Amino acid sequence: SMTDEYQLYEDIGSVVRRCVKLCTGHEYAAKIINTKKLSARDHQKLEREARICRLLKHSNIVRLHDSISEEGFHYLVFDLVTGGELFEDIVAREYYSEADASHCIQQILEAVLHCHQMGVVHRDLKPENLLLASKCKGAAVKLADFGLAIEVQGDQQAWFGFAGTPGYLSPEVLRKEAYGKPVDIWACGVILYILLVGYPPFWDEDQHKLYQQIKAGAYDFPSPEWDTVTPEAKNLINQMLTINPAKRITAHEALKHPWVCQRSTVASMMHRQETVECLKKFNARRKLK
Numbered sequence: 001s002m003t004d005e006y007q008l009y010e011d012i013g014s015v016v017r018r019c020v021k022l023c024t025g026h027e028y029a030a031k032i033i034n035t036k037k038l039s040a041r042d043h044q045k046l047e048r049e050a051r052i053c054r055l056l057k058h059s060n061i062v063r064l065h066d067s068i069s070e071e072g073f074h075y076l077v078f079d080l081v082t083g084g085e086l087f088e089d090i091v092a093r094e095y096y097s098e099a100d101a102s103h104c105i106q107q108i109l110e111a112v113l114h115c116h117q118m119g120v121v122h123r124d125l126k127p128e129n130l131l132l133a134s135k136c137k138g139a140a141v142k143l144a145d146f147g148l149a150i151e152v153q154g155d156q157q158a159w160f161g162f163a164g165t166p167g168y169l170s171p172e173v174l175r176k177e178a179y180g181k182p183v184d185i186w187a188c189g190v191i192l193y194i195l196l197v198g199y200p201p202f203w204d205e206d207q208h209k210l211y212q213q214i215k216a217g218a219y220d221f222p223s224p225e226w227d228t229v230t231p232e233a234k235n236l237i238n239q240m241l242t243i244n245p246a247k248r249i250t251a252h253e254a255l256k257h258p259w260v261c262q263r264s265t266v267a268s269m270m271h272r273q274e275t276v277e278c279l280k281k282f283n284a285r286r287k288l289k
């Protein structure tokens with residue numbers, strides 16, 4: 001079926017291959033899941049991801065086109081978005097300000113709010129899952145990869161397990177405590193910090209040491225580079241990177257923050273060349289692991 005209706009080409013970003021639907025000619029992105037030796041637990045996980053990806057239709061989340069079960073393999077076929085990773089586009093721009101970073105985080109927070117309204121916690125918000133719709137200027141930021149996503153019942157929090165990328169892990173996950181939606185907003189804080197200065201709030205070559213920093217919530221806003229960053233941006237990072245998840249800002253409240261919703265008057269329009277140059281180094285460091 002899928003082997004008669006599509007043609008598969010190169011691996012994108014399970015394997016994820018760019019494909020073309022033969023009858024229409026349009027391009028897609030197929031997540032190819034080998035299901036021959038799958039434990040019962042993992043069949044439920046894959047059913048769940050498919051179900052999550054069908055449920056979530058939003059301007060800023062990559063859309064599922066189809067879900068195709070075959071012998072040995074399952075295919076989740078998504079719309080192809082062709083603008084690449086957000087962070088790789090930012091380093092290529094002539095102008096980059098807080099206003100631009102506010103615009104990105106706004107779109108990301110709209111994606112996260114929608115997941116959270118639908119009962120979905122992504123659990124692996126990181127740069128590689130933030131894609132641009134196209135190479136056109138002002139292309140939407142789109143959230144990808146719900147591989148690690150879970151379904152929650154309302155605001156019911158629980159220990160769902162370790163999942164996610166070290167630098168973006170929340171304190172409550174690292175303390176092996178009950179968590180839920182707030183872990184996504186922590187990750188969004190970490191992304192926002194990198195979006196403003198081009199390096200992470202938490203870093204250590206030793207990861208046990210990194211996890212201690214995160215559990216402590218020990219970041220700061222060093223001079224000189226944070227000296228020019230508006231206090232309203234720093235305020236928002238502080239509300240997202242709050243260690244107590246009950247006190248942490250929600251996606252709904254974060255979108256009502258003035259730096260996000262009154263960007264044209266609150267966020268700095270000043271070019272931040274040093275950010276762009278740190279991002280370049282950041283991007284280089286990550287594509288080496």
Ligand SMILES: CNc1cc(Nc2cc(C3CC3)[nH]n2)nc(Nc2ccc(CC#N)cc2)n1
Nearest residue numbers: 012013016029062078079080081084085144145
């Ligand atoms: C040009 N640069 C790109 C393009 C691209 N195209 C995509 C991917 C998708 C859905 C995620 C399957 N739609 N369009 N994906 C990526 N990265 C990427 C990120 C996550 C995944 C895994 C998932 N889900 C696969 C690829 N980098």
